[PDB]
From a paper:
Two Agrobacterium ABC-transporters and their cognate periplasmic binding proteins (PBPs) OccJ and NocT import octopine and nopaline/octopine, respectively. Recognition and import of opines are conferred by periplasmic binding proteins (PBPs) and their associated ATP-binding cassette (ABC) transporters. The PBP OccJ is associated with the octopine transporter of octopine-type A. tumefaciens while NocT is associated with nopaline uptake in the nopaline-type A. tumefaciens. OccJ shares 47% sequence identity with NocT and belongs to cluster F within the PBP structural classification.
Numbering used by the authors:
A (entry chain B): 23 to 275
B (entry chain A): 20 to 276
Amino acid sequence: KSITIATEGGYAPWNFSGPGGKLDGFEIDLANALCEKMKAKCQIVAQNWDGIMPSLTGKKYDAIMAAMSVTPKRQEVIGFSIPYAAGINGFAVMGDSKLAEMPGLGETYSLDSQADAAKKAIADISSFLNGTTVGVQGSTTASTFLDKYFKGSVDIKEYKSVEEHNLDLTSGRLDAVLANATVLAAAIEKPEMKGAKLVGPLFSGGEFGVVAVGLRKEDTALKADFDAAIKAASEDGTIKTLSLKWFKVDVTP
Amino acid sequence: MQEKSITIATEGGYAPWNFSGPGGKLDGFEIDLANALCEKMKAKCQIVAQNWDGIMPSLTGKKYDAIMAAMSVTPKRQEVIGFSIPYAAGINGFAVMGDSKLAEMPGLGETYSLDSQADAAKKAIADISSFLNGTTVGVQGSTTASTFLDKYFKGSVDIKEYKSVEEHNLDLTSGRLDAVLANATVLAAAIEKPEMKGAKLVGPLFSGGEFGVVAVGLRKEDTALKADFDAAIKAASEDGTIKTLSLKWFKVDVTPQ
Ligand SMILES: C[C@@H](N[C@@H](CCCNC(=N)N)C(=O)O)C(=O)O
Ligand SMILES: C[C@@H](N[C@@H](CCCNC(=N)N)C(=O)O)C(=O)O
Ligand SMILES: [Cl-]
Ligand SMILES: [Cl-]
Ligand SMILES: [Cl-]
Ligand SMILES: [Cl-]
Ligand SMILES: [Cl-]
Ligand SMILES: [Cl-]
Ligand SMILES: [Cl-]
Ligand SMILES: [Cl-]
Ligand SMILES: [Cl-]
Ligand SMILES: [Cl-]
Ligand SMILES: [Cl-]
Ligand SMILES: [Cl-]
Ligand SMILES: [Cl-]
Ligand SMILES: [Cl-]
Ligand code: NA
Ligand code: NA
Ligand code: NA
Ligand code: NA
Ligand code: NA
Ligand code: NA
Ligand code: NA
Ligand code: NA
Ligand code: NA
């Protein structure tokens, strides 16, 4: 019994690599814990974000564990296991800038249960970010969110990876970036991002949704195995433990 | 009773010498070495991050006491700062995308000392320079690599200078650059990361000359701190610590002698 799991490796603490390229993070530890429950040999591979879904359908590997949110558009092309996590997103800017004054600092809005307050916070941020350049990783729930609420207000610059937009924020090429808050909180702690800060509000639900294992639609048995393993790992505190270990928070839905 | 205290600056952008964990904790050969040297010196070790561009003005400006950021001793640097006895030596090479015609550069698997094999090194340089004609080569500005490129490849290649290794590596993978030149252990570690899939170390490896030896950067007249580091490095070289840490981090011996 063997399962090849693809991750990106550019999204710490979910998935990243050590100095010599060894894949590590919450999803690597989770993949191994799930495969132990499934009684299967676990092979974790790296695949760039852009080609992660065509390589799954192309059978280069069997599953995706790369902090992939379940979205109706993705559900048209691939299948998903039951969720193991949920995404919370926010903006980061250079802490010195006037943009650090973004309203709603640290306030959290669920796009599902607080649609009225979230759309007001979004409207305030959009007006506040008028004429700025915002970096985002292309083909993400974050680029979808920016396209939906900030398009004619902000100049949206899309990047292949988080690392790429973060370097353009620190050089001053970008005014702000939008990404998963745990990813940004980890990134701004790195020496290269000295001076960067999380600002304004945090958003969950809606576009961001929940994170699950990406699988081919026809792999019903593999989905059934992952579903039983995630249920069992949620039930014995395994996922919560790994989340606290990596994120110092609980990302479980 | 209480130990003295030293603040050591590193860059954090030069794995496996110095880099950081996902949450910014500084790690690598120089972090392990800094802590081992401070234990020998019986001093409290505080390791801080400082970008390469401002690393020397912040040392002279007394933001910290020492630099352990894989800094080579050069006559130009010796005019402005002091150095401890060396703890390592730099080996440099080019990296390109393996699919580039540039990957066939003469001659992979070879090493040339610019000090002892000057004749064979200049002959190999003359071949690489002609081979790289009209290409764009990325390099970290104010390094032994930028000095080496300025000396032998200026006028043959378009040299593009970057503030960090990570920046030129991203421009190599996007195709903005044809090649990069940097420390081979740094490039060998970098090409193993998912972002640098397809990149490869090509052509020969160079040591000595411009590259020289790595030592702790200190304020020019901070003689007590230099005396402290010199005794610790001597003791650390004597018990195999530097060789051990070198093998642990690079899987090659970087010690000079
Ligand atoms: C958990 C995260 N999901 C996003 C971004 C994931 C990008 N993953 C990666 N670069 N590895 C998505 O699936 O589009 C979020 O919404 O907060
Ligand atoms: C060891 C290395 N030294 C170079 C490059 C070091 C850059 N260091 C860093 N980015 N932390 C130099 O001192 O100019 C070398 O010559 O192979
Ligand atoms: Cl990484
Ligand atoms: Cl590693
Ligand atoms: Cl909710
Ligand atoms: Cl929590
Ligand atoms: Cl005291
Ligand atoms: Cl860390
Ligand atoms: Cl720390
Ligand atoms: Cl420290
Ligand atoms: Cl070296
Ligand atoms: Cl030219
Ligand atoms: Cl140019
Ligand atoms: Cl340019
Ligand atoms: Cl090497
Ligand atoms: Cl490629
Ligand atoms: Na925000
Ligand atoms: Na900013
Ligand atoms: Na020699
Ligand atoms: Na160098
Ligand atoms: Na610049
Ligand atoms: Na660097
Ligand atoms: Na050398
Ligand atoms: Na000195
Ligand atoms: Na002194």
